[PDB]
Symmetry: D2
Subunit: 452 residues, 4 copies
């Protein structure tokens, strides 16, 4: 139900236990924005599960055996062999993180004017696709956009929508299908193996390429083992390996399910695309033999990816997130359902019914959570889409409580839960927010605000 941590604590990280009065002053000095908070001031930093993971003793042992050679590093050979064994792809190009691989793939597989369709989008992924002249098309099923709808495998691609795109646009105008596992924006929702089969069957009949966003593929593999009939007696590794058998390649942000603080890579089976990838990695990331990573980090990511295949680790990872979601739902706090693999998303619509989507209820809710609890959370509603004078209104207005892997305990989840439950009582005190500075691209990171 809620298993204990399948590991011991080897080393602890020093945190600051500042009281509520000083936390309020830290939030005021930050203009009531979580993205502008200082790490030294935050008790529980649930901003993102990206690169915030706690490594293992075996990974740190590999950190001591960094082969920092420019070419022919043993660390690269270990990572390349590991990814080939576990993902089954023919070739791998290391990158410094996921958006590095996305830059490479979007320049290699996109013709200007073609379409790229996927199960929702991500900020960096959609940018590099549109940067390279592609038009994004959301082919996730409509249910994935309903926060409260609790159905399994919400990340599945609607085959009818995919068939409609091929009929109206033609397979020649479709660069590739971008299948993300899991689907971050929908709440960390998984994709079923049956859906990955069906997408592969339909795309191959039209010669359409399929590239995965493998960023949280191990979490996705756990949901298959838990909820998809027929996979209950299959290991996580067997599920991961079969998942990528239905893809032509993948981009991976190791900073997620590879249990590292930096790292990523690009996979493909096509020899010619791999040749062009090595040409492009040099000018952006580095040599194909390190790709913008130190040897020690290629070693840590190779070891981390193998550690993620342990059933007990990934079961505890997901169920710890589920514990936080279950305790909030039991108290009546509105959340995105079902709980995803990496985060609990607070529904800012129902949390702030009095506020409209112009008043930015999610950002002021996240800013209110830290002031009252000392926990940082990420606004993942409207400001991620931005400001539009010619706003780019999304249906999901959420506040993301993102859990780094192997960093926090259930008692930490209780502090998060108990503090948010108390904020839910007087949810009317949450004010509105408006832009005062707007980046032309990816605005939620550097945007400043003021109360309405």
């Amino acid at each position: 139900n809620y298993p204990a941590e399948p590991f011991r604590i080897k080393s602890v990280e020093t945190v600051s236990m500042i009281p509520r009065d000083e936390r309020l002053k830290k939030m005021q000095e930050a203009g009531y924005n979580t993205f502008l908070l200082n790490s030294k001031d935050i008790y529980i930093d649930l901003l993102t599960d990206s690169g915030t993971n706690a490594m293992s003793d075996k990974q740190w042992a590999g950190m001591m055996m960094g082969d920092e050679a420019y070419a022919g590093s043993e660390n690269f050979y270990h990572l390349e062999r590991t990814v080939q064994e576990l993902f089954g792809f023919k070739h791998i190009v290391p990158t410094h993180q996921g958006r590095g691989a996305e830059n490479l793939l979007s320049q290699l597989a996109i013709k200007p004017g073609q379409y790229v369709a996927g199960n929702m989008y991500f900020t960096t992924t959609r940018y590099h696709q549109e940067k390279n002249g592609a038009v994004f098309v959301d082919i996730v099923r409509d249910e994935a956009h309903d926060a409260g709808l609790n159905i399994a495998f919400k990340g599945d691609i609607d085959l009818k929508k995919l068939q409609k795109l091929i009929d109206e646009k033609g397979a020649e105008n479709i660069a590739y299908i971008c299948l993300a596992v899991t689907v971050n924006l929908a709440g960390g929702q998984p994709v079923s193996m049956a859906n990955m089969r069906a997408v592969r069957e339909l795309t191959a009949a039209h010669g359409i390429k399929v590239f995965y966003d493998a960023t949280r593929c191990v979490e996705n593999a756990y949901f298959i083992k838990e909820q998809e009939q027929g996979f209950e007696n299959k290991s996580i590794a067997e599920i991961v390996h079969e998942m990528f058998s239905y893809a032509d390649g993948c981009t991976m942000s190791g900073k997620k399910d590879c249990l590292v603080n930096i790292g990523g890579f690009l996979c493909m089976n096509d020899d010619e695309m791999f040749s062009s990838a090595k040409e492009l990695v040099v000018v952006y990331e580095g040599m194909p033999s390190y790709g913008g990573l130190a040897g020690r980090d290629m070693e840590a990511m190779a070891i981390g990816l193998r550690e993620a295949m342990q059933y007990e680790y990934i079961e505890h990872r997901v169920k710890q997130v589920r514990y936080l979601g279950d305790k909030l739902k039991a108290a009546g706090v509105p959340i995105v359902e079902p709980v995803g693999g990496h985060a609990v998303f607070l529904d800012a619509r129902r949390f702030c019914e009095h506020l409209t989507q112009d008043e930015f209820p999610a950002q002021s809710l996240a800013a209110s959570i830290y002031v009252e609890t000392g926990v940082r959370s990420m606004e993942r509603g409207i400001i991620s889409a931005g400001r539009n004078n010619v706003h780019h209104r999304p249906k999901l207005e959420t506040v993301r409580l993102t859990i780094p892997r192997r960093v926090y305990t259930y008692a930490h989840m209780d502090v998060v839960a108990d503090g948010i439950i108390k904020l839910y009582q007087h949810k009317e005190d949450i004010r509105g927010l408006k832009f005062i500075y707007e980046p032309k691209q990816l605005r939620a990171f550097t945007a400043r605000f003021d109360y309405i």
Copy 2:
């Protein structure tokens, strides 16, 4: 009560997570003796809180700055300055752990034939005292021997017993008073500050030295802050500093409250004894500048001792143990009370009423606990008590216990639940636990290598 961990996990330690049928295999290969289990086969190892603590990122940063010089290491000066500031003693000699310091103190402050009195005893501490020709006297309060009596500060010394010792035996025949904080043998019970001041006041009137067994002095200081009236406004470091102001020195096992995996030291104020300590440390430990420790470990112990002063850390340490004891007590599991600062003791005599002590209920209960949960605990009953080497019979202690010793900053409340739920489930059918018989029994220290089989 029961606060969250006042820290994040920086790195983790890999464990095997073997199933029950496999754990039974391992326990049988271990001769049903948890001492013979392999670390790689254990999920939660509660054998001891000594040397098993998890260090901090700042401690591991110190591990990269080891000044490994044979003399004059910067790490020694950091350790020296820290102990001087926090404990207030004038001189410090490092040792590789606590019994190394006890070896030195017993040779320096004990004349053959003298007495050493203190609030009960520890095995290594008492050995070095008796090894140097001293007779041990237990001057602890009588309430300390009532394992079920739930009162505060059971480790306090009975001032009347000390006064009676000074009357019946000459004060010139008393080497020193060994005040231990906390008192391990009573279950980890603390000593009040008022008791330390009264012992210092009575001994100073007769010119009698007082040295502390301070291995768990930080745990002791938290009990003073929590339960002793008048210290609610004083920080842990202020309490620690005042504690040692009533002593002429101490022996310290850093492996306990200094949050390290190795290390100790010896403190004193007398300049002449410090000169003799430096001549003797070379014989057994090393130079006064490292004393049997790598430079990096003096640095880690210096950093860890300062981290122990954080109220939130030590409150969580003590209350995590208390959470385990409280959950067991609430389900009817018999435990030694009150819960100490570092371990929960199961009353195996009560737990296994259907077994006699000759059938080793504590050893069998520990074997059962591992099979059902993957938790290693330590037998602290008839097996550890040994045999009378003259008559051949068992040493039969009044306490037939299983010790759940909690390393610092290693486990979570979820791990405490694994220990509790498995023990509580075992207790709900405790009549099924079988007695053990000797299959192999060594000459000495039989707890470490003896092997058993079910009767």
Copy 3:
């Protein structure tokens, strides 16, 4: 001259030490291409000084204090405060290495059709300039193209060429001047402070921006202190700070002079460009608070950049390279002169006079050097020059060289002797070195994966 290492060895890196007959096996399996050799088969790897440096104990202590937070990491603030103090620039954006910063700068400061002029070029630097629609102009002094001309500060910009560029092409059509310190393509030649002041003086009169390629700016600063009169009383940090006072920003590869294995950053003073830099770093690198780097690596780079300011360290770094070049020159081995701050370049055209450039003497000499010593070097001749993709013929550079690139704080003078003695012995029978022919040749970047066999 030739000072001892201003540091001790804290830890070592294991090497295989395979014999010659084994090394020949490895070289043949590598297709006689040192780029295809395995690191585990190499005793002394002089392929590059990028990312191959040995860190300090203090840097590794920082590696234990990584604040891995996605935004607001303490490691970023340490890096930011350090670069601001030592370089004097107003704003800093971290990147995972140097070409990441070059990607940002070229997109921020180049309008399609403009010119970018600088003292020669580097491959990645020039690519991002031309990728963003710029035309590169070489305004270096003519003496820089004379590989045997032994004069000081061969990297200085020809002020007349810059003045002529401002006259023939509009100043509004010049994106910026890319002043590199040092100049890699000339062999690692430094730029004088008087030249940087004259470039800043001339450009500021026309409102033209100046950005530095500062990857080896610390090596450059030592040459100023050693050879430029008037700086003999100024510290390295004072020289570094004055250098960047003549620039509006810089791109930095920490993998070079910041003594790290990964990392870089982008600096500028303009607030508006810094705002656009923060919007763009998210696209390719990461947040302005980590920019494609783990927290621990921002900490290591912050510590390493400050350590680079120590005069004794950088004097030994440059003079260790100079020792290799001096020993080779004293035996008659032909090298590019003067020796640069980071590498010694063998003149393979002169070394292998009996071979034509179509027989790849630099590639063959590097293959021979590894077989005889276990030293990997880099071909920097016709193979690395590539093919003309329109005509199919080789790119034929005037420099047919083998590069002995020295990582910082990794090797000793004894290792330099291994390189020198083996090369000197090869030179004493240089007529025995055989030419190479293509066995496998890829489409692009043939230096990395091509395979050869003896003719």
Copy 4:
């Protein structure tokens, strides 16, 4: 001849480059004593090769995999297996360093009044023997006491002296033979395999036990491979294994040839003695399963001992010491000959001919070396023996330049050599020294002095 370091530098240690004027002030603030110097003030610290070694990346990887369990640690199993494989002994008890094992052995194998004979002595070793009621008898050959005599294998035990002890005292009154490899006090001189054979043959015929001081046994093994006929085609490991086949047990200070900064152990083949050892290790060192060592240090010592078997490592180790000795001898500086495996010993008699052995020329020479060179050295002449009113005059009056393993370079040796050569020109400026404080035992460490 002088091979390069068979390794690369992975990490460097920060040193202080204080000029001569400030070094002189640091020596004055220390009363012209090297033992009282601060590590932060010293450029090249040649005080001892004990625990000052630089570990490898593989050892530091093991430092990250410390199994800190009180019993059953994987690190103990690795160390126990490694010592059994490489030394061939049946049982091993870890100790925190060598004198910990010496305390154990002397209490287990010495009856009060018995004799312990060996090839010279060491400070801590002889103490524990005499502490337990044994009378030490030096059975090294006379040549070992002549500093300038350059003969091979000076550490060999004189079989005639050993035969004389058995004839005059009887084998029943001889506790054991203590065979040290190498012989520290003689200058690091090796012992030949033929001598270890002959000692074993003669002792076994009388039932006399033989226990080795294995502290610098790998250096000893190299000398056998280099200079003893028949062993030139035998590996270091084969030589080490055969060496201990002629012994009943050993005490080992891992802080020397095991390439660690802390650690040691006790070996024996006798089951009964091993049982008593486990009884005694508990009260002094700790459990037989860690013996006063953290798990990570048992791991590092196990890995270090295996690394010492590499011929290239140990060849460079000894020849680097030899390089320092050769450069000093070529300039006319008087030294102990031949150069030992771990240190170069400056003959203070010939370096200070004007001073007598009451004026303590070695201590003032060592104090003068640091003031002029910034290098710390250890007085290893008279003050190690002490002050006698009822001095304990030894024949060797030496200043030890002790080289830690894998820490320094040839350029460091040149700085040491060039500075001592200049001090040798005006060797008359070296004054005398007299005691002002005298420890009752092991005095040279805490003794203070003043000029005569």
